[PDB]
Every structure is written in structure tokens, then in C-alpha cells.
Amino acid sequence: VEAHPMKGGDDSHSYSQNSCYQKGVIDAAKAVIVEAVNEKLDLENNPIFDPIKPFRIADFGCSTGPNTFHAMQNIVESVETKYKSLQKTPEFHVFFNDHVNNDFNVLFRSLPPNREFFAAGVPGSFYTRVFPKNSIHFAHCSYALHWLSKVPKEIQDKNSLAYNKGRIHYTGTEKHVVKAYFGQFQRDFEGFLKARAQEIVVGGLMVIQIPGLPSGEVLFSRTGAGLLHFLLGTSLMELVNKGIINEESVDSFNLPQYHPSVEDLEMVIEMNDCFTIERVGTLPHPMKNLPFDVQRTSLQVRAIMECILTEHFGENILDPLFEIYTKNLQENFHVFDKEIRKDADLYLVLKRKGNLEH
Amino acid sequence: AVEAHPMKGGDDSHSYSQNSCYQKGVIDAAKAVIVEAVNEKLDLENNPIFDPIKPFRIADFGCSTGPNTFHAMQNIVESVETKYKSLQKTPEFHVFFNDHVNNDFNVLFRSLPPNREFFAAGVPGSFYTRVFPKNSIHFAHCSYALHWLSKVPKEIQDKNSLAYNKGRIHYTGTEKHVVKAYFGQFQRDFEGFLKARAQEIVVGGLMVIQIPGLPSGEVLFSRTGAGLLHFLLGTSLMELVNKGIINEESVDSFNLPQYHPSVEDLEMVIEMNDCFTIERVGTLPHPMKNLPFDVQRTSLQVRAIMECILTEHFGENILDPLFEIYTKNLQENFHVFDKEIRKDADLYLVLKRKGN
Ligand SMILES: C[C@@H]1[C@H]2[C@H](O[C@@H]3O[C@H](CO)[C@@H](O)[C@H](O)[C@H]3O)OC=C(C(=O)O)[C@H]2C[C@@H]1O
Ligand SMILES: Nc1ncnc2c1ncn2[C@@H]1O[C@H](CSCC[C@H](N)C(=O)O)[C@@H](O)[C@H]1O
Ligand SMILES: Nc1ncnc2c1ncn2[C@@H]1O[C@H](CSCC[C@H](N)C(=O)O)[C@@H](O)[C@H]1O
């Protein structure tokens, strides 16, 4: 399965309380949800959405909260509002999906007590089927689909054209490595869409928010995620040159992520042919005109990468890794604060096609 | 509201998952009941309510952490699947695992069988409340959970009442005021459970219940294994009082929120609720009936069940001294458990949700 969930407690080092960026994405996304419900959720006279049956909502890659709760409440409230305009009130059933090793204990223990929906947790890779056919009316996936199901094996192979020596991700400049990652993304995202097309009802909506490439931009390294990753690699190599880890440990380490362009996403979706694209765009993120926060960014990265870094390098690498990291962020403060593209959060609104619609 | 006392989490040698073999035997014995219930009472053929275009939805109420809940759910899926095949249908299955919010769903999820043929979801919440949309469950299951009350009866906590449960932590059956208080709480809780389930289960849907109870013809709960295990847990606590390790008031004020009903107790609540018919009822033949009493495993079984509620009231420093004494007392009562106790205390029900 090759699963890497986020740091799962409720304390200072947990995802719950180092996921403020991904929350701003949700906050700006509320408008996206509301507009998609009002313009594209066809409730009226439509037995697919018969309010005598429950309205079922699923979050794919929900993590441990609070972001997933804000997102789900946004959807429940927008949908409940439209039904109200039709003098109906269905029950809501909300499903929280993540990897089997996600901390569902923490999630369940922090469910809003005030909630007006029934809740369930659904353990399993969203690159597989996790629901019966035709059961989901509204699907949501925010900041999860850039995670691949695995590192492309050819970049781990010393003898491959695509061997990713001396780096932990891609920048856009090495043709063979980028091709390997993009190839893996095509397969994973197609598997996601295939599973969702079976699970989502005809006319059902799916909203996706994903770290991507800003339009026109060809170099992932000129995004914020891209430079952060590049510096993580250079920070690891400094631990190498000090002798604290060997060079093989870094050569063999790679991030299982791809950050697609809008054109990349559109290609896979159109080929899959089960969803219509109702809208694509970018999310203006709320913290955009604040100054770059060197310290807090270094913490957000650690809370994301801790497990995968530990599992490969061991616990004892973290504290000295990220003190080097923070240092490299500071030397690059200008770039992060005034040069890098702020607009790399992409969103898509999809609608599941009818069975007689090609 | 909710006073939740889940079983010991994790998957190590002290966990519920490694110390719940007796509860597994109950499910193993009930497999025959499920098969017969499906074959004779689940009206699949040409019934729009069980339209295999939709999934067949199964819920386990009080599932804990595995593996017992997986065995029960596999048994239900296999029997229902078999019957559908005889009608040349092949529905998908959606299996819901319900327990308290503080249950260890992490352990449960991480130990789900890889080769299952059902979609799975965990549902956190007290089963004395609604936890599913109305009219959505086709088959409900509940094994060794419904003897857990929503709370201790207030009467037995009241120093002014003859029901005040001084120097004891449960009932043996000789104290009529205490027994009446627990039975009262049980009618209220079990009624609330049936009410919520009637809203959730489809017309003709089944509910299968296994519960520790009062054996046929028996009046004294202390004549069951559970009853004697509780009696001796009380006396072990009073030994800690005597040794100055806990004060007497802490035992006086502590009580187990449990009631172990007779069949007649169960029938009375079900008849008054009036939403289910009793299709089958009886006592299970437990597969461990003829094995020798195991002192160490039984002590560990009880700790796995009780550690949370004991810790909340007495503090964790009490646990090891308490179960050192408990183990000694189980050993002193070896022959009673081995040969004298009634072992026919596993009751079952097959209920079917009524029309109108
Ligand atoms: C000590 C009892 C335990 C019970 O013990 C069993 O109770 C049955 C019924 O009396 C006996 O036959 C058997 O010997 C004994 O192991 O096993 C399962 C319980 C639970 O799941 O909460 C608890 C309930 C009660 O706390
Ligand atoms: N294949 C997969 N199946 C299920 N969850 C996955 C997954 N790949 C990544 N994830 C999950 O996606 C989450 C990304 S963190 C994002 C969490 C949340 N949606 C938010 O907006 O803040 C993690 O919890 C991770 O475990
Ligand atoms: N009100 C309630 N709501 C949900 N679960 C409850 C409950 N009261 C007790 N339980 C759960 O019921 C379980 C009883 S132990 C039985 C576990 C499992 N059915 C088996 O056969 O082994 C515990 O996990 C306990 O937490």
C-alpha cells in the first residue's frame, strides 16, 4: 500500500495543529463549494437526490481534523440550504476516508458534538474502491491527490535512465525523472477516478483541491512546494557531508508526490471520460500577503514528512535535519517571500456523467 | 450524558484483542443461529426492500477492537451471500462497526481481514442513540454488549436508600432493592436501544443478539461465571481497603453499570417496545464448556474488560495490586468456577423488524 499519513496526535507536533495552510485552502474553498452546489447540484425533481433517502458525503484523505470537519460542515450547510429552498430536509451521512494507519481515534474523539450529520470512518487507500456502487452524492478531496501510491520504481533503480541520484524529488529539469513521476501520477489519478466513477451517483459532484503547477509554469522548483522539497534534499546532503548519514541513504530516498498542471489533470479526466469538468481554477490563499514565516514553514514541513523521513532515516535525523533546513530557508527568505509563485493551489469541480452520455 | 467504558485497546498480550476468547466462542456457537435465521426468516426473494441493486448493509453494535467482530461479520456476509446466490443475485455488502467514541478503532481498522468481500466503515457513538439514517440497515448484530447499561442506577448511589450498594460493586441476586434498581435501568436502556434500532432497520430486517444473562430457572446471578467474577472483584477491592491501599468510601461509591437479564426480562422489554417480533430465542452451547478453568487467562480477560472503568474511579496505581489479589481469589475458588458454576448463561435472540 505504501501509506504515509500525517503526524497523528492533538499536541504541538501533530497535523491537527500544524495544518493551518491546508485550512486556508478550505476557507477560500467554501466559495467553491457553495457555487458548485447552487449552480451544478441538480436536486429539484431528481430522484437521484430523493430527500427521503440520506444525502451521502465523502472526504477522501480526511486526516485527523480540524480541516476535514470545516470542509464537511461547508458541504452539509450548502446542500441543506438548497434543499430548504425546495422545502425538504434529508438526513446527512458523512464518510471520512484515509489510509488504514491514519489516526481515526483522534478524528473520532474530536468530531463536533454539535453536528447535524451521521458520521463514519472508512479506512483504505482511495486508489481503491472503498464504497458500494452509486452511494456517494458529493465527494471531496483536498490536498491529498498529489500523494502517489508509490515512488516510481525506475527512479530507485541505479541502472535506470531515470535514477534520481543526489536528490529526493524532481525540479522539472531532468527529463527522465519528471516522466517517471508524471507516469505514476497518470496511473494513480486514473485509478482514483475509476473508483469514484463507480461510487458517485450520476449527477453527483466531486471537488478536488490539489497542490499543482501554476498556469504556464513548467518548473516545479519555482513553486513553494518545489523549492521546499529542493532545500530538503540539500539539507539532507549537508547531513551527508558531515557524515551523520551516508550518501546512499539520500540517493535511495524520494518523495512519492507529483504536482500536476491543470492541463495534466484535464488530460487524465478527459481520457477517463466518466466526469465532466464543470470548473477548474486556482485558490487565492488567505495568508498570501503575510511575510514568509521561516520558523513555522519548517514546522509544517516536518509534521508532513516526519513519518516518511523517520521510516527511511530513523528518528535521530529529524532534529538536526530541520535545524539545517530552517537555515537554508532563511538564506532563501527573499525567494519565498517575494519571488515564488503564490498561486499553485488548484481546484476542480467535476460532475459524474449519465450512462447515456458517451 | 455518555458514560463510556471501552475494553483495553492496543493489540498486545494485555489487550482485549488477545484476551477475548470466551466472547469468540459465543460467536462461534451463534453461527448456526445466524445461518438458520437467514435461511428461514430473511425474506430476500422478490422483496423490493432487499433489492440487490442496493448494497446489503450490516451493523455490529459494540464491536470493540477485533478479531471477534470480524468473525461475526464474516458469518453474516457468507450466509446472506449464499442465500442471494440461490436467487442468482450478487449484491455488494456494506459492514458497519459501531462502538463508543473512545473505542480503539485504530487497532480495529489495522486488523481488518485483507481478503474480505465487504466494504467497511467504523461508526463512533453510543448505541443507546441513533447512529444510522432511518430505514438503512438490513441486518443488525450485537454480541456481549447489551448487558452494559448507559449508567449506574442512581438509587444504588444514594446513601439514603435501602438500595445503597455499600461494600459491594455489583449484585448477587440476594439484595432485592439493588437488583430491582439494576433491572429498572436495564428496561430503560434496552428499550432505548430497540427504539433506535427500529428506526434504522428496514421492515423484515433481522437483529441477532447474544448476551450474558440469567440461565434458565436460575434466580441467583452469583451462580453464573460473570456473577462470581464480579463478586470476587468486589471482595478483592475490599481487601485493598483492609490493607489501607484504597479507602472504604471509594468502594462503596463504585458500581458496575451492568445487568444480566433472564429470557423473561428480555421478552418483556421487547413486547412492550412492540417494534420487533421474537423469531428465535434460547441458550447457546458454549464451546469452552468442558475445558478446565484457566485462572491466568480469566484474570487477564477481566482486566481487559474492566481496566478503563477501574482506572477512572480508583486511579491506575490500583490496577496491579488489585489483580494480584484477584488472581489469588480466582485460584482459591478454582473448584467453584471449574465444576459448580452454571455455564449455560449465553442467551440469544433473533428479532425481525415489524411492518405496520
Ligand atoms: C465478567 C463478565 C465478563 C464475562 O465473563 C463471562 O461471563 C459469562 C456469563 O456469565 C460466563 O459464562 C463466563 O464464565 C465469563 O467468562 O465475558 C464477557 C464480558 C463483556 O464482554 O463485557 C464481561 C461481562 C462481565 O463483566
Ligand atoms: N491513497 C490514499 N488513500 C487515503 N488517504 C490518503 C492517500 N494518500 C494520502 N492520503 C491522505 O491524505 C491526507 C493528506 S493531508 C490533507 C488532509 C485534509 N484533506 C486537509 O485538507 O487538511 C493524509 O491524511 C494522507 O494520509
Ligand atoms: N452504549 C454503548 N454503545 C456502543 N458500544 C458499547 C456501548 N456499551 C458497551 N459497548 C461496547 O460493547 C463492547 C462489549 S465487549 C464485546 C465486544 C465484541 N462484540 C465481542 O463479541 O467480543 C465493548 O467494546 C464496549 O465498549
3-state DSSP of B209-223: EEEECCCCCCCCHHH
Cβ pair A344, A218 in contact under 8 A: no
CATH of the domain at A201: 3.40.50.150
Residues 6+ apart with CB under 8 A from A13: A7, A302, A303, A306
Task: Tell me what percent of chain A is helix, strand and coil, each rounded to the nearest 5.
Answer: 45, 15, 40
Please name which of A195, A80, A199 lies closest in space to residue A137, comparing C-alpha atoms. A199
B102 and B174 co-located in one domain: no
A 10 A CB-CB count for B314 gives 18
DSSP H or E segment with residue B282 = strand B276-283
User: Domain span at residue B175?
Assistant: 1-18+151-181+217-255+288-340
Contacts of A108 in chain B (CB under 8 A): 101, 105, 122, 124
Residue of A100, A131, A133 with shortest CB distance to B109: A100
CA atoms within 13 A on the CB side of A20: 12
Tally of domains within chain A: 2
d(CA B220, CA B340): 13
Which residues face B207 on adjacent strands?
A: B140, B351
CA atoms within 13 A on the CB side of A109: 14
Find the farthest-apart pair of alpha carbons in chain A and give their distance in angstroms, rounded. Answer: 69
B235: which 3 cell numbers? 471482595
CA of B300 to the centre of ligand 1 (A): 12
Burial of B322 per CB tally in 10 Å (0-12, 13-18, 19+):
buried
CA distances (Å), origin B295, targets A242, B229, B309, B340: 58, 11, 22, 15
Experimental method: X-ray
B143 and B34 co-located in one domain: yes
- Ligand 3 binding pocket (C-beta < 6 A) is B 6-7, 20, 23, 27, 62-64, 68-69, 98-100, 103, 126-128, 143-145, 148
A 10 A CB-CB count for B150 gives 19
Q: Which atom of ligand 2 is nearest to the CA of A141?
A: 19
Closest-CA residue in chain A for B118? A132
A5 and A82 co-located in one domain: no
Residues 6+ apart with CB under 8 A from A117: A57, A72, A76, A91, A92, A93, A94
- Pick from B77, B95, B106 the residue to mutate for testing the A interface (most A CBs within 10 Å): B106
- Ligand 2 binding pocket (C-beta < 6 A) is A 5-6, 19, 22, 26, 61-63, 67-68, 97-99, 102, 125-127, 142-144, 147
- Ligand 1 binding pocket (C-beta < 6 A) is B 22-23, 144, 212, 224-226, 229, 302, 305, 343, 345
Contact B109 A121 (CB under 8 A): yes
Strands, DSSP E only, in chain A? 55-60, 92-98, 118-123, 136-142, 200-211, 275-282, 345-352
Cβ pair A151, A254 in contact under 8 A: yes
CA pseudo-torsion sign A102, A105, A106, A107: positive
For residue B234, the 8-state DSSP code is H
Cβ pair A15, A64 in contact under 8 A: yes
- Residue the block writes with cell 485460584: B331
> Which residues of A does the annotation place in the binding site?
15, 21-22, 62, 67, 98-99, 125-126, 146-147, 164, 225, 229, 251, 253-254, 257, 300
A103 and A51 co-located in one domain: yes
CA distances (Å), origin A13, targets A5, A301, A307: 14, 11, 12
B235 and B336 co-located in one domain: yes
Task: Show which residues on chain A lie within 8 Å of chain B, measured between beta carbons.
Answer: 53-54, 91, 93, 95, 100-101, 103-105, 108-109, 111, 118-124, 129-133, 135
Residues 6+ apart with CB under 8 A from B15: B8, B9, B65, B107, B304
Amino acid (one-letter) located at A319:
D
DSSP H or E segment with residue B226 = helix B225-242
B64 and B107 co-located in one domain: yes
d(CA B234, CA B95): 38
d(CA B121, CA A132): 11
B128 and B261 co-located in one domain: yes
d(CA B173, CA B222): 7
d(CA A313, CA A237): 13
Residues 6+ apart with CB under 8 A from A158: none
B12 and B118 co-located in one domain: no
d(CA A36, CA A31): 8
Task: Tell me what percent of chain B is helix, strand and coil, each rounded to the nearest 5.
Answer: 45, 15, 40
- From B2, B7, B95, B197, the mutation candidate for ligand 3 (largest count of ligand atoms within 8 A of CB) is B7
d(CA B351, CA B266): 11
CA of B118 to the centre of ligand 1 (A): 30
- Residue the block writes with cell 466513477: A197
A266 and A202 co-located in one domain: yes
A41 and A175 co-located in one domain: no
CA distances (Å), origin A107, targets B55, B261, B297: 26, 35, 33
Residues 6+ apart with CB under 8 A from B24: B67, B68, B71
SS3 B249: helix
A291 and A313 co-located in one domain: yes
Please name which of B328, B201, B310, B337 lies closest in space to residue B246, comparing C-alpha atoms. B310
Contact B122 A119 (CB under 8 A): no
B86 and B231 co-located in one domain: no
Degrees, nearest 5: CA angle A204-A205-A206:
130
Q: Which atom of ligand 3 is nearest to the CA of B20?
A: 22
